[PDB]
Amino acid sequence: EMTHRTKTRPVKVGNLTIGGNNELIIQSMTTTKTHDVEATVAEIKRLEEAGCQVVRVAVPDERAANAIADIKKQINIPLVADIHFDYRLALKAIEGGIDKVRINPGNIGRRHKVEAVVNAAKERGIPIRIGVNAGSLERHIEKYGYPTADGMVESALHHIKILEDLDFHDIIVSMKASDVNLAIEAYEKAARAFDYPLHLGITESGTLFAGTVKSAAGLGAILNKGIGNTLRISLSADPVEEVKVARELLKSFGLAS
Amino acid sequence: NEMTHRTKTRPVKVGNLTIGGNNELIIQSMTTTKTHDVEATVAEIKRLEEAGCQVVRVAVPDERAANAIADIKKQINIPLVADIHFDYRLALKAIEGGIDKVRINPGNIGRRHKVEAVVNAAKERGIPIRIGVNAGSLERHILEKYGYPTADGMVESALHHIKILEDLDFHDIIVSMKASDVNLAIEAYEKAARAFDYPLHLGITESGTLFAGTVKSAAGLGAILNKGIGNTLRISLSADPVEEVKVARELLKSFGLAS
Amino acid sequence: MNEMTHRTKTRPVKVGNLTIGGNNELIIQSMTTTKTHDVEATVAEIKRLEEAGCQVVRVAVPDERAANAIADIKKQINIPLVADIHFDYRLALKAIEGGIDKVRINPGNIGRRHKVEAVVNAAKERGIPIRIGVNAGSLERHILEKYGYPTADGMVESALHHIKILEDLDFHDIIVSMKASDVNLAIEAYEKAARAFDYPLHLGITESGTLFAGTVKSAAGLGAILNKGIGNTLRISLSADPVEEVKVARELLKSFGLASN
Amino acid sequence: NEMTHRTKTRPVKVGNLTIGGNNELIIQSMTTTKTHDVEATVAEIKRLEEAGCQVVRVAVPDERAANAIADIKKQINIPLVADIHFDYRLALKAIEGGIDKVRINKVEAVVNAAKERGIPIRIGVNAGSLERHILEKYGYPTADGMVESALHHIKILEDLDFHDIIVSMKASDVNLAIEAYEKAARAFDYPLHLGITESGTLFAGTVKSAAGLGAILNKGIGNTLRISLSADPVEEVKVARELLKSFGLAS
Ligand SMILES: [Cl-]
Ligand SMILES: [Cl-]
Ligand SMILES: [Cl-]
Ligand SMILES: [Cl-]
Ligand SMILES: [Cl-]
């Protein structure tokens, strides 16, 4: 049985709550150099002007991690940081005021690294988004022979398990794929597999037109199931258009944000 | 109840094609020219043929439009379809004119001999009929029963059109459930798949700018295609009909439901 | 078995003051996206096209109001104009009387003897050429029933009958297009075309859904074709402004060291 | 000699992927980050992967990059290719770090390391860097010099019992690029790695590469391809898909 978006666990992200209500928070991400504070801030204010409620920035390095405080001081909406496995960058961004870190626990390595992150996260009440991706499933998951709905949830489970073992339940999860049937199938199962809020997203298509049609369709079928607490529409275009498609999708179903 | 999957629906012939009973959806659009202007309508259908359109609907508001069907036919490949709202003479004229499928409202037409001539006209010529229920066009008693347009009322209307034709030994039926509201559209099609075995023609009433029409159509149709129903479809957009085909092709590519 | 004729060996066919065929040049073309009857809009789109380097422009002539507007459009532009009419011969006669510089129509579609010889003699009198345009997606039913689906042999079967209708009227002022979506078919249709007849070929590829996909698919396909040494004129079809079509054609020709003259 | 069809080229493994012996080309891209900056590099690969990239090349200009190779692989799921130019040592380093393929042109020590790990070597021939003696023989860069340069390199590996070779024939002039791959395909049956060196703007490089590679693909050769652009690595994957997808050449 699927956990409706209204009975999912509430997760505080800055001043907003994701999960435990029927409000789909709109998110996006920047295209700028995260360490280029002026450019990043400029693009963020254009996203805020468009209707963006939460925005993510890639933190590939120290320059980027160092830019966090300077960015957040010049913005109004919550700022999430992208980090695949570097615990030092995780720690630097957290210290800097990020509102949430998108990091997959199982990639961090040795337990002491995993704890340095979770402890920092609890210290200032920041959540983690577990972001499962169809193109980047663990090497071992030689088990299915290719990305499948089952391989995504299992990878997801593994990541939640590490946080729950550390008494950490402030978690948001995403199951992002490029294929629509796999997309729908993945969120369906993750909703039946766990109670955390689901961050909806489909992989960027080659063109803006392809991506607009595919995402509108895939997320359309997921929202109709009563699931999803937040969403990000990924498109080969200026981020503002992602906010526009997201707004149009939610208005279409008569959904509030 | 059981949702009749698309592969479990009744196969009908629309020209040289088979709609229903399989796991593929045939793309359809409509010409924006006056059917009377032969070259104009052909020129537009040629662009749609080039684009990948598989079935095309032409305006048949009057007798001149109906009388040009054979001329259009000599110059194209794909099946020609036509919607007749009220006047049965237009349906009859279109049928004898060489149409491949007609969209009629048995209950509106009028006299029993009127419907019998069209049913027979279509039955004789071996042509299918499409029953198209539209949320904004429900019968008076339907709206009085439910109070406003609703999935159940569209389904009530559908069955009756179907029953009129079934009572005249007519079964080459395709059913459309067109609404503007996606929530209604999604429901309307889900209950139709549970209420009968005929193939369903998926369409959403166009609303807003091209940008909004494209998003809302993709959204609603995404939820319906994931339900495993739909055997044919058309995207409606105030734009060059070719754009409708583009959108339909992307949608099918996404789900892997193209012919 | 028959050798592909090299673009420099195709029959030279004059279009306006230009010569398509019997040379190593590739004439670049585009098509308007306006209503032909809207003279002002159409002439302004053509002027933008000329500015980007377009050499020949085709306009649809779907009704009588568009064919009567040919004369006034011609008076305002400096590049040869082309009427695209699928079969209505009263619309082509008007286009020809309007002073069109070429007509894109397939004679086997007209397709009544008094109707064919009329359009034929009218063109003969004005000394204007006819481009036959076979499109994989708009092939005749008797081809489809025979081959099953669109094939190169089928497109070649089609082109040959339209060509015969004309050759049988002692008309040889002909250019041929073989349009397909599938890049593999397009490539084979044009090599099969070069072996069957010596008429210069007009290279085109159906427009993909988007500008990006269209640019890649068309450069990849036409590049394949151009490298065989065939084709005498081309048109890129894109879901974009016609100016984008001219820019892709220029950069594509630039890539092969080929010129427009 | 007639050209060796892509389906008849000598199979070569790269990670879990086969390169050669089938009618489908593998998509490659290349990172732009500092290979020694691990999260940075991994982040780019992660976007590449998602976009449909199948193999990725990372620059190894020195030992910093060479040492990061292992940490990069424990994070990614597509095979990595190293690109070494002058130092035989950096290639040795990249191989110890688990590189899945080394693109390179002591000499026996590199092969022994390549033998030991069971990894191939992509001989990379380029029109912009042919040795002086073939330039002195042919006068300028040409298809005959390229194939001759590729054969002299193929010879040395073969004499050392190493046959797991993949070959590229890089040039900026479309007509030379075409002629070279045709020429290549005839001389040897090793799989071909298609690429066109970039020139001009993004617009210009997109048209040129698709045009050249289309002609090449039409001839039925090539088992792997790379679209060289000066932008986000995902733009190279975007061009590559449309191209392969248009010709009917799957993953
Ligand atoms: Cl570790
Ligand atoms: Cl450490
Ligand atoms: Cl727990
Ligand atoms: Cl009457
Ligand atoms: Cl409205």
Curated annotation (Swiss-Prot), chain C:
Keywords: 4Fe-4S, Iron, Iron-sulfur, Isoprene biosynthesis, Metal-binding, Oxidoreductase. It comes from the Bacteria. Pathway: Isoprenoid biosynthesis; isopentenyl diphosphate biosynthesis via DXP pathway; isopentenyl diphosphate from 1-deoxy-D-xylulose 5-phosphate: step 5/6. Its EC number is 1.17.7.3. GO terms for biological process: isopentenyl diphosphate biosynthetic process, methylerythritol 4-phosphate pathway; terpenoid biosynthetic process. Signal peptide: none annotated. One of its GO terms (molecular function) is iron ion binding. The keyword RNA-binding does not apply. Its cofactor is [4Fe-4S] cluster. Binds 1 [4Fe-4S] cluster. It catalyses: (2E)-4-hydroxy-3-methylbut-2-enyl diphosphate + oxidized [flavodoxin] + H2O + 2 H(+) = 2-C-methyl-D-erythritol 2,4-cyclic diphosphate + reduced [flavodoxin]. Belongs to the IspG family. Converts 2C-methyl-D-erythritol 2,4-cyclodiphosphate (ME-2,4cPP) into 1-hydroxy-2-methyl-2-(E)-butenyl 4-diphosphate. This is 4-hydroxy-3-methylbut-2-en-1-yl diphosphate synthase (flavodoxin).
